[PDB]
Every structure is written in C-alpha cells, then in structure tokens.
C-alpha cells in the first residue's frame, strides 16, 4: 500500500515523497502539516531527520519530506 | 458650539427642581444634543461635569449643618430627587452614551460619582451617627420612621463606586460595608454588652434567658425591614457572641440548679440558645 519514492536531491537538501492509500490518506489534516511523531504514528517507516514541509492541494494523498545533508 | 449651550443649560436647570415639563421641551433638548453631535462631544461632556459639580456644591452649601434627625429628612429627600432627575438627564443625553463615551463615563454614572463626592463631606458621618442615634430605640419606642432609614440604607448600597472599576456586574456594597455596617455592629455589641450585664446583676437568670431570646428574635427581624440582606449572618453571630458565649459559667450554675429545679421548658430554650453557639452541649452533657 504505502509506496515510497527514490531520493532526489539538490546541492543542500535531499528529498523524498510518499503516497498513501485511501483509508490512510483520509486522515491527513488539511490545516496544519505534521511532525516526525505524527507521521510515524500514521505508519511511515524511515530514518531520522526527515521533515514534512509541503501539502499539495489538488492531491492530498501525497506527502513530501526532506532532511539536510 | 455656543448658541446651543445656553438653552441646554436652561433646560437642565428646568429638569432639576422638577415641575413635570412637557414632552415638547424634552424633544427640543434631545434635538439640541443630537444636532451638536453631528458635524465628537468632549467639550459638552466637560461642560456637563462642570455644571453638575457647581450645582451640587451650591446645594450642599444650604441644608447642611444640622447634626441629627433633620440631616435625614433633608438627605433622603435630596438624594431621591437628585437620583430621579439625573436618571431623566441620562435619558436626554442618550446620544453621547452611544457614540463618544464608547471610545474611552456615562452621564448617569458621572452624576453618581459627583454625588459620591458630595458624600465625602461631614454629610457622611453625621447621617450615620444620627441613624445610630435613632436605632438606639432598640430598647423601645415606636417612633422609628423606617422611611428615614431605608432611604439612607439604599443610598449606601447604590453609591458603590463604579467609574470604570471593571463594569456594571451587580451588587457593589463596598461603601455599605466600609462606612455603615462596621459602626452599626460595634455599637450593637457595646449596647448589648452593657445591658445584659446590668440586667444580670439584678434578676434571676430565667428572665435573662427570656429577654435574650426576645432580643434575638427582634434583631433577626430588624434586618429584614431596615438593612440590606447581606447583613443577617454577621449580626446573628455577634449578638449570639454577646448575649451568650460570654456567660457560660452562669449558664452552668443555673443548669445545675434547674436540674435541682423542676422546669423541663427552660430546658428547651436553654438548649436552643446553647445550640446557637458552638460546642456548648459538651459542657451541658458532661454535668448532665
């Protein structure tokens, strides 16, 4: 269900995005974005330091994280 | 403006010392007030405050300096008339209260504040002393004109200062507590302490108990017809602490001898009295 994406990076940060199924995606808050504890509770599984930093209005079921180098 | 001010002042002179003017005059005054506030009425507010201070000082000059029994029949009348006429005046200048006093002082509250500054005159202690003298008829004498007391009591209740303290909440009895209740309670204690002892030194204790109960019921009734309701508890506590709670040893002796006597009824009244006070029955049960 949870589909991850490859790492694409610029000269200073390094990124990733993650898709969600319908049941999980129905949970995301549309007012404030999240924090590491929040999305780990959601059910994401990855390293330490990734920061949720954007919401895309047309498609809410996609999350965008980043973490510095 | 100026031309408005003369007629307005004359009209306000008319509203005080009321002669029940006609609604045409009142609409003329209201229209003047509304007209000036459309062209921002700080200046008119200042003039109103000035005029009230002047008039009330002049009224104080006369009628004062009586010291008893006539400071009341003067003060209650003046307070009543001034309150009514000031209420009407607040009615007239109602346009200020909506559009300039809202950016901060209502006219009625200003009038009450000025009358309060008339209260902090010898007119404060004199009237209280005279009321105490009149209620010195706690002994007897159906000459207590309750309309000469309830007016002052209500005035003391009302004048609780409110000028932007927080807001109009409800009962503001600060002035009542700090300028009338204390003296009343102290005098009550003093008089009862004197009379109870002098009566004890001449009579058997049964009549003392009867008189104590009678005075208790009388002083519970008295508050319901004279004073503000937030007074019953403290007065009851003090009158109990004076009429009883300070002759318990005499109570013990009479308790012993009434057990030597054959009265089961002073039993009941004694029980009611001692129950009115704390922890009495233990000494009653123990010698029992």
């Amino acid at each position: 269900q949870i589909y991850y994406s490859d790492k694409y990076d610029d000269e200073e940060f390094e990124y990733r995005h993650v898709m969600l199924p319908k049941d999980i995606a129905k949970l995301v808050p549309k007012t404030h974005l999240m924090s590491e504890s929040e999305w780990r509770n959601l059910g994401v599984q990855q390293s330490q330091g990734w920061v949720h930093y954007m919401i895309h209005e047309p498609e809410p079921h996609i999350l965008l994280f980043r973490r510095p180098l | 403006l100026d031309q408005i001010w003369d007629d307005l002042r004359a009209g306000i002179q008319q509203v005080y010392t009321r002669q029940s003017m006609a609604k045409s005059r009142y609409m003329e005054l209201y229209t003047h007030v509304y007209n000036y506030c459309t062209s921002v009425g700080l200046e008119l507010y200042k003039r109103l405050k000035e005029f009230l201070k002047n008039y009330l000082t002049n009224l104080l000059k006369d009628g004062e300096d009586l010291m008893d029994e006539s400071v009341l029949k003067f003060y209650t009348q003046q307070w009543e008339d001034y309150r009514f006429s000031s209420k009407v005046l607040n009615g007239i200048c109602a346009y200020l209260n909506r559009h300039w006093v809202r950016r901060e002082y209502e006219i009625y509250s200003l009038a009450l504040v000025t009358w309060r500054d008339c209260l902090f005159r010898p007119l404060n202690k004199q009237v209280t002393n005279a009321v105490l003298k009149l209620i010195e008829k706690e002994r007897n004498g159906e000459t207590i004109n309750t309309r000469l007391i309830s007016g002052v009591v209500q005035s003391y209740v009302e004048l609780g200062l409110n000028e932007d303290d927080a807001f109009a909440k409800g009962p503001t009895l600060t002035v009542y507590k700090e300028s009338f209740e204390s003296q009343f309670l102290a005098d009550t204690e003093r008089f009862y302490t004197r009379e109870s002892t002098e009566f004890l030194q001449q009579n058997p204790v049964t009549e003392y108990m009867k008189k104590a109960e009678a005075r208790l019921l009388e002083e519970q009734r008295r508050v319901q017809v004279y004073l503000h309701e937030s007074t019953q508890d403290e007065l009851a506590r003090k009158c109990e602490q004076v009429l009883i709670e300070k002759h318990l040893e005499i109570f013990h002796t009479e308790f012993q001898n009434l057990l030597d006597a054959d009265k089961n009824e002073d039993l009941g009244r004694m029980y009611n009295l001692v129950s009115r006070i704390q922890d009495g029955l233990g000494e009653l049960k123990k010698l029992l």
């Binding site: - | 045409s24 009142y26 609409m27 209201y30 229209t31 509304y34 009615g91 109602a94 346009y95 909506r98």
Partner: protein, 138 residues
Amino acid sequence: PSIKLQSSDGEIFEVDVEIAKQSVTIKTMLEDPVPLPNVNAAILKKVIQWCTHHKDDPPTDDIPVWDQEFLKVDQGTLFELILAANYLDIKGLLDVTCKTVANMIKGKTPEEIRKTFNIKNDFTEEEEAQVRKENQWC
C-alpha cells in the same frame, strides 16, 4: 393607548404606544402632540409602516424581501431615511438600510462610485498612483 406624533410641519399621525415603543428614543422619553423637528411626514409615514411591519418580531446576511422592496426607492430618500433612523435610534431599520447601501456600493469602481454619490474628489492626479501602489497585494 396611542400617542400623537407630530412631524416638523404638523402631520400628526396617531400611532399605537406598542408600535412607537420600537424606537428607543421614544421608549425612554415615554418612560418618564410630540414634535420631532428633524423628520418630515414623508419619512415618518414610511417609518411607521416599517415599524408596524416589524412590530411583532422576536428580538449578504439574508436581507428580508419585504424591506428590500420597501427599500427599492431612490437615493435622496435613502439618505434622509438613514438620518431619520439614526435620529430615532431604531436598531433593525438602521441595520437593514446600512446593509442595503453596502450591497449597492459593491461592484463599482472609484470613478463610478464618486459619480453616483456626488462626492467631490480632492488631492488627486499625483497621489492616486501612490495609493494604488500601497495596494498591489490585494
């Protein structure tokens, strides 16, 4: 009972006390032929009609259609009517007139608004560019 309300020119319209009670000023005056030298009969009759229509109220933003058609009248009377409502200090009537004027201003440009309201523009031709510069972020 009833009260004899006299306009600025004698058009005495006898009106129920419970109807005139709607106006706060008259309410407080009655609390303790009455001329109202700031209202003529033309406005007074319409005010009485409106009050009688709202006499039994409980006591955008969903303007009632009765008032709306009652307000479907030209400019000068609207101006005089707002002033009369302020002078007598009636809440709902002043509110609805203000709301109608607001909705009627909606849509037009500064030129059109300035034209329709007979507003005398001033301090212009050199600073309006600056004031619009203050408002790009709109």
